[PDB]
Amino acid sequence: PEHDERKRLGLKTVIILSSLYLLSIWVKKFKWAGIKTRKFVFNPPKPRK
Amino acid sequence: AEVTQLSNGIVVATEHNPSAHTASVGVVFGSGAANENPYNNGVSNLWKNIFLSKENSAVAAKEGLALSSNISRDFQSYIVSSLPGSTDKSLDFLNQSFIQQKANLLSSSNFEATKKSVLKQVQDFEENDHPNRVLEHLHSTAFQNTPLSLPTRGTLESLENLVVADLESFANNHFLNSNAVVVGTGNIKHEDLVNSIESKNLSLQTGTKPVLKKKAAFLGSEVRLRDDTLPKAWISLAVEGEPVNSPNYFVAKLAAQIFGSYNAFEPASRLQGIKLLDNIQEYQLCDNFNHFSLSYKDSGLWGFSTATRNVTMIDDLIHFTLKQWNRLTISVTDTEVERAKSLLKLQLGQLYESGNPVNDANLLGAEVLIKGSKLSLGEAFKKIDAITVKDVKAWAGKRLWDQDIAIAGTGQIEGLLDYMRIRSDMSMMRW
Lengths: 49, 431
Description:
The structure is cut from a larger assembly and holds chains A and B.
Chain A: H1 3-31, H2 33-36
Chain B: E1 3-7, E2 11-16, E3 23-29, H1 43-51, H2 54-63, E4 66-71, E5 76-82, H3 87-100, H4 108-128, H5 130-142, H6 156-159, H7 164-174, E6 180-186, H8 190-198, E7 221-226, E8 233-240, H9 249-259, E9 261-263, H10 277-283, E10 288-295, E11 300-308, H11 314-325, H12 327-330, H13 334-352, H14 357-371, H15 377-385, H16 389-399, E12 406-411, H17 419-423
PDB class: membrane protein
Keywords: mitochondria, electron transport
Entry title: Cryo-EM structure of Saccharomyces cerevisiae bc1 complex in azoxystrobin-bound state
């Protein structure tokens, strides 16, 4: 008996949860960009220490 | 106290003091380390040590003269000092050794001995002088790929490629009459100096210097040089600041005076009226710090440097300092502003009224080259007295609140957290 109400409530839930999923991908990729482009350089130290 | 500027083709500036017992006369050029490229970096530092070489200093010493030279980012100077009755001999020495003849100084035997001595100085700087080389690395990361990033001494890799023809090429482009100011400080009158120059017909060269194409630009970045065999950690941090000829030039210097300097081993330094010292002395978070406000022709830097033996609590030291910087936008009080006014006037008065005419010759020539005149100390005191609390809050809302930073560090810096944890402390999520 809940069939017509269950499908109307499911449409509001899927739209809200889809928007929060797509926004969290943008925010994660913005906050990780400093780590992902980090660069390292090695110069061997002088001996006798 | 009065300065006098006069132009007859050559700009001549003086600052007479009849109470002093020496005199000082030299020439200041309007090019520095920010007028070089990454392949001739260190050519200004080589020209200084050519002027201060042994055979040149020996000719001056038989007359009774002493020599000085200074290299900065925007200017460089070459100064002769003497007793007040022999300023004619000091102006002759500047004419023969530096203007007319330079094949005497640039001989092959003198050039190779000078280049060996400079390479040893730069090597000992990079291995032992940890506070000053972190501040040099702060400039190179904040202004990367831009003329304001080159170090004033040069690097070891760029200095060994320099030959005699590189120094003559720099002198033909920058040591010009339209780039120079003749200065005189101490016990020397103004009209006696302009008649000694006009009794000859001095002129360096006619023409203008090259124009660089890239302007200075701040970039939020960091550079880490970790060395676990050193006993401390050394850290510098800054935002983009004010240039020379800025309307907020004195407001930025007063904001740095609010937080000031500190020494944990001096007992009177522990009793200063700075609210940051309550958090630091509870668990002994550092050994010293100092705040600064540097200014150049195109940009500037505002921030602090520190040195620490407490290497497990580095994150508490950065966090407490940046939460006090937030108060300049939100809740700075009127009694903190009045204290910073008196201490800025004492600090500026000690810089410009020391008893050294060599220090006065460097300050006078650098200011006439940019502005065309010199602001007196009496007029600088009246601009400081007119600053209100609302001036401080409006400056900090533009330059400090939610802005990008630049970080440099060396030593035991494992406890220094990454960039985004420090960048998020530039705002409170309260206001």
